[PDB]
Amino acid sequence: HMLEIKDPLNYEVEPFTFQNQDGKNVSLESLKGEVWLADFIFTNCETICPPMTAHMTDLQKKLKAENIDVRIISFSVDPENDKPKQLKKFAANYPLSFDNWDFLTGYSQSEIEEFALKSFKAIVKKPEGEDQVIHQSSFYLVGPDGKVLKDYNGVENTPYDDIISDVKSASTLK
């Protein structure tokens, strides 16, 4: 045994309704039941170079097999300055497929705040990100209830299973 008997997570992402990069409305309603993948990023600074979305892009392939109605959601970090147009432009660089990939607006950080706080601690307002600034591109695997059950970090080094698990227990063992 090491980190106990592994790093089970249960990170409940509070349901809400969002608009995707198609201007199309989607809620957790459409995903709760399913094992849907999640991430969140900006693209505003950066030239495009590291394997940032590359992991997601690679997994988009696998997704065909997982498809059922699992979607890989990807919400905007600081959507006021970035905006879904930047995610679109970035998707025009990282050679990805909207195919079965819901890039979500979230809208103003006031809107994004409570959502991303509860869900992931991932707001931009008072904190800048004190972690999710430099080059993080962490996966979440969001379970059927809406609780996350695995993470990964793509570029390895800080897999985020371990951290989110530890935070899970430390919080109040969700």
Curated annotation (Swiss-Prot):
UniProt name for this protein: SCO1 protein homolog
Pfam families xref list: SCO1-SenC
Main location: membrane
Entry-linked InterPro entries: SCO1/SenC (IPR003782), Thioredoxin-like_sf (IPR036249), Thioredoxin_domain (IPR013766)
Keywords: Cell membrane, Chaperone, Copper, Lipoprotein, Membrane, Metal-binding, Palmitate, Signal
Membrane topology: Lipid-anchor
Family classification: Belongs to the SCO1/2 family.
Natural source organism: Bacillus subtilis (strain 168)
PROSITE patterns, A to Z: THIOREDOXIN_2
Cellular localization per UniProt: Cell membrane
Coiled-coil annotated residue ranges, if any: none
